[model samples]
Target: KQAFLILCLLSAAFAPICVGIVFLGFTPDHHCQSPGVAELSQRCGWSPAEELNYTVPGLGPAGEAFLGQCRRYEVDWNQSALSCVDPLASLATNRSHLPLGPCQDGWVYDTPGSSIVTEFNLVCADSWKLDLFQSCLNAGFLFGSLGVGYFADRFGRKLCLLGTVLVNAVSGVLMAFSPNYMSMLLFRLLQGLVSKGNWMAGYTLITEFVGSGSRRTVAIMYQMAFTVGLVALTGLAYALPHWRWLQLAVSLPTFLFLLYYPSFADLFRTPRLRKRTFILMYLWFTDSVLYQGLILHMGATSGNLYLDFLYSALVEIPGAFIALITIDRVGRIYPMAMSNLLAGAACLVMIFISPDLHWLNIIIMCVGRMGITIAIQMICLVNAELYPTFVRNLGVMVCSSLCDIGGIITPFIVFRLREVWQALPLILFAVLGLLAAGVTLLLPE
Candidate 1:
């Protein structure tokens, strides 16, 4: 049991590591502005006014051009103000300047060859394909959790862990060398499915092996490895700008994971626990969505990718320690509730404070990250303990899946809400965090 626990914990530790794959698509320190837009303005002999105006000669109709240009400039033209600037020279340069043009003086934003995807050039000419590529992985996770949870419950954790490691390694490598977006997405999905299964198998194995007293501590630490992975992600992204190389570096680690499974054992050798395991799988699904949405959305909104990523990563270290001490001392409910409440409050604070002292904003964000990390670790540990050995795998699979759901909804929340108030998403995060706390309080464990 001790050997199995250590091996499984080590394997489960990779869950957060793989979750850091999101960072692979991240282009920290790079602005989304169109290239050559500034050059076009300079060529036109336009002064680098706080704003500039131009009419695309071929695109717009006689008066339609003027109307469109007027509408574009009617709002803000300040470069820093908008989330996305126009592809054309006028709207592109001065995104912060409001009331960009009168009907007759309006300018058309045109860069026939430029796009947000192209500017970042994430996957060369197929940069726009990244969104689908990411979604494919999520889809893989959805299925992997469901399918693999059953397998873990039936076949034993060790077997599932080994199988997933082999598949994840192969799929991840295939993804790196994919010739086009379609192939990339296909392989990425395969990787996601296997990676998630591997994580669940590892998590179940550890909790089953550990004594009741040690379970929470080990489980929380397992999750902490994810924060470590996040920190690693920032360094890797900074060092390897090319997406393919970064993919290879991150995916290659799975290969080493295969050796560990040979030493692993199934703590749950019985058959009656399969139903409970299914329930756990569903819970994980919900948790995965929610957790993923919150973090990803937070990353997107809290610009300055490296700094934001750093703050998020730094906070989790202390969070894990706090969970380690509190989960056993105060018991699961108090620490979990308090952490969620604090996280929610911190999100609200970040929304209000971000506009003024950007430094304080970062601090508050770190606080929120810490709180969420603690809550997540606590939930995972506690949930594992509550379930019988038979259904333990099921419980984890169901609960962790919510993280992914959260991830899917988070971007829309952040991007869409920005249309109303720039900080609206933060407010929503506060609400959800608090609600999660309330829910935690109701859990029997």
Candidate 2:
């Protein structure tokens, strides 16, 4: 009872910090600058609706396809010659004919509060910065994992865990107050350097402390913490939408999670299983790529980002619950492959569907999320059953690092491909997922 209580606080407290980056860096819809317009309109007694309809250029006038969000009218708003009744009248002769230029002024955000993007103006040419935010984090994970893992091995889990937690806490706070994107990136990179290490340390400590747990119980409990964290993150973001404060809110909890005295898995023993293992490992790697890709891309989901987040998070809940109830009864092999294949099929089919199918796109994403949820759990459960202790740990850790690797690459995958065609990432995900499914079917019972 006491032990579970300790873990409860550890997970309940720390899990939010682990995934908070997803929300902290979330970009809200915004448009290019035609600065001084809002205040000008206000002085001229324009309603907020009137301000947006004329000044902003996403739908209609700019043409439905080429959203003029990133580009703005070349007309000078301060010109006394311009009428207050319609701001862009001089520049845009007939809407699409507008002489659009780079955002000469700054941008105006539709967000209630600030994101790193809002504060930094990371749109248009600067938009890549948001991708780099997550990229920086995974780079930290990629480089730091081996070093941190070794330290945990050499110095002992307790000492390493404490040090990483301390560093993570310090870095996270500094990240919140960082003055510019370079500084923010620096702190975030530093936070990344230690945060994953800290997370690894915590997981190692707890798992060792309770080494005898049922695998199902452990996996579900851990995932449940992740789900809880996502839920908490949604509420926190809703309550404190500002990125700095949201980062602070999430970071502050890292300090408390360690108060519970925790530490934390491996997957490699069967040389015979290594045959199936290689196949599984590749698929394992692929799932992380797609799973994370989906989550990050959900920002483009239909409707508002925050409301979409709420819906997405809530959508995830039933997925976990549904999988948990059925997996034991149906067993692992068939369901594992089918869930992954289902996700792959959806990814492929979705790419062909037009973005105009808004609600359908949302439903497909939710369905994909649910399949991924089950697919991952089944893989973990299946892998554990196929291995013994020591090698299993080595194997899982090695394979699990691929999840971090997937994180490192997914931003590039989703964001870069998105630049060419919005659906490109989904198409790529479809290919990877289907390949993973093909290999998963070949894995032994």
Candidate 3:
């Protein structure tokens, strides 16, 4: 009970890091434009409109679709003979039919300054690079959860929690100063590995300290703090051009989390606990898959990436509140299973709906996020209840590794499956969530 406030403090400190994961990694409207192409456009007496009209190719529609943000016309815009007068006319007889190739020079982002994508020039042929940014982090997470899970269980929760914190904080700072993307990815992996481990440990600690009367309420509130963290991230990302520094800045709180050390005993005292653990982990994995997956894929299709993120973040606030009100009365399992069930059904039904109903799309997507948030809150509540005092932190951390595991495969799932069909990720997320709903019912009370 003495550790209650400190552990809650640690939870608050930890959430802003998760905020950095999505908003700070934001990829906004962008296109492939050779550097100086703009300068060259002005020299040829072209306005921004004429430059895009004549110089850049587009997709789908004339007005609404994106400009070629990655591939570009193969012709040399800089060539002395090409017309400033009618650039598109001189380039090819049938402009639309002209061969297309990669953006040799770089990209032009719609935003004011740098992002991982704009900085790395991850567009068109190289677009997959952005996927790797998230992939490597989850890759580290998959192993981190397993290793740190064991450490929390084996070494003692306090020591393992502080140890992961120290390592994660350092890795985060090291990431900011990384000389290049390669090193940044390495640093991100290191941070990713320990961060999830620390989260499970922290969740267990915070919940362990609370009175059962308040545990459900307090857990939902802690989850809601993440909502505030997103608002803070919006301001930070808005003000700072050096996006990497946000990671460095967010790492500061991990040091305060260093003040506490906690852990658990053997793997399991009983056979039932071990079997129950696997089912819980699988459920955690599926929840994560849909939660992160739907958000990423849908946000992209929204046309305005950052704006959609703001809306998405805002919607979750009401969601956490909804659970806080109902969780105490309805209990954890029912809320979670129902939430996943509804979210899964929503995604399945959304596939058949026309893209013309983007308003409906946004509504359905928001509802899906809400449902998953309920499940997220349920897991945190239920995990602490399931494990005993001796192994609480270890049990929680180890089981939630599947969350990281689901995260590890999600980028691949969302990106690769979309190649087959744009909505394939949603289809996959629907199936995963429905499976989670079924499995959640099987959990021990």
**Predictions in order: lDDT:** 0.58, 0.72, 0.72
Q: How far is candidate 1 from the true structure (C-alpha RMSD, Å)?
A: 9.2
Candidate 3 lDDT tens digits, 1-445: 4465555555655555544545555677666667557666877888877787777786646343333765677777777677888777876787778877765666667777666776776665566777787788888887886776457568876677667778887888788788788998898888878877766576666766777888777677666666766666666665676677776666666666555444333554556766677777877888888877876676456665566666777888887888887776667778888999989988888788788887777778778888888778778768877777676666776676777777778877776667667778778888888898998888866
Please give each candidate's TM-score.
Answer: 0.69, 0.86, 0.83
Q: Write the per-residue lDDT of candidate 1 for residues 1-445, one digit (tens) a residue.
A: 5565445444534543445545555423221133344554454444433224342222244333323322333433234433323334434454333343333332222223222233335432233354554566666777776777467668855566667778787877777677765666678778777776666556666767777788766666667666666766678766776666767777776655655541112323444344334333433433443455456665555556677777777878888898787866788777878887887788777766635576777787778778777777776666677776675554455556655654545444544554466667667777777776666665565
Give a tens-digit lDDT track for model 2, residues 1-445. 5655544444655555545556676666666666567668877788877877777664764344336567776666777666678756745567667667776677777778787777888777777778888888877777777687677678866677678877887888888888888988888777778866665554555566665545456656766666777778788888996888887887777767556550121123445555766776787788888777887787644565566666666776777776787776767777778888889988998888787887787778778878888888788767666666656666666677777778888887887778787778988899998888878877766
Global CA lDDT computed for model 1: 0.58
Model 3 compared with the native: what TM-score? 0.83
Using TM-score as the measure, the top candidate is 2
RMSD (Å) of each candidate, 1 decimal = 9.2, 4.0, 4.3
Better of 1 and 2 by lDDT: 2
Please give the clash total of every predicted structure, in order: 51, 19, 8
Off by over 4 Å in 1: 1-18, 27-134, 150-159, 258-290, 388-393, 415-421
Looking at candidate 2, the ten consecutive residues that score lowest on lDDT are 262-271
